[PDB]
Amino acid sequence: LKLDKENALDRAEQAEADKKAAEDRSKQLEDELVSLQKKLKGTEDE
Amino acid sequence: LKLDKENALDRAEQAEADKKAAEDRSKQLEDELVSLQKKLKGTEDE
User: Fold this and answer.
1) DSSP state, A1?
2) In what helix (H) or strand (E) does residue A23 lie, and over which residues does it extend?
3) How far apart are CA B16 and CA B14, in angstroms?
4) B5-14 burial: b if 16+ Cβ within 10 Å, else e
């Protein structure tokens, strides 16, 4: 049914939204591995 | 519709696989951020 696709799609769509969120978390963490590494090196340089 | 529960379920498996890969990266990056933070603080306290 449309409801089985809608539910499976909600899982897929939400999973894509969750990929966006998971990607936002991981790209932000990578940006923050850079900020932490940069700040680590900020502190290492200091 | 009829096969979309299946296409969307497989899409969800893939979308979940990718939100998971992004989330696994978030966790790995979270561990690295934290490691960098511990090292940053190692260097900041230093």
Assistant:
1) -
2) helix A2-45
3) 5
4) beebbebbee
Resolution to one decimal, Å: 7.8
Closest-CA distance, A34 to chain B, in angstroms, reads: 9
Q: Is A46 helix (H, G, I), strand (E, B) or coil?
A: coil
Distance from CA of A29 to the nearest CA of B (A): 6
Give me the DSSP letters along chain B. -TTHHHHHHHHHHHHHHHHHHHHHHHHHHHHHHHHHHHHHHHHHH-
Report how far residue A15's alpha carbon sits from residue A17's, in angstroms, rounded to the nearest whole number. 5
- Is A40 within 8 Å of B33 (Cβ atoms)? no
- Calculate the CA A18 to chain-centre distance: 8
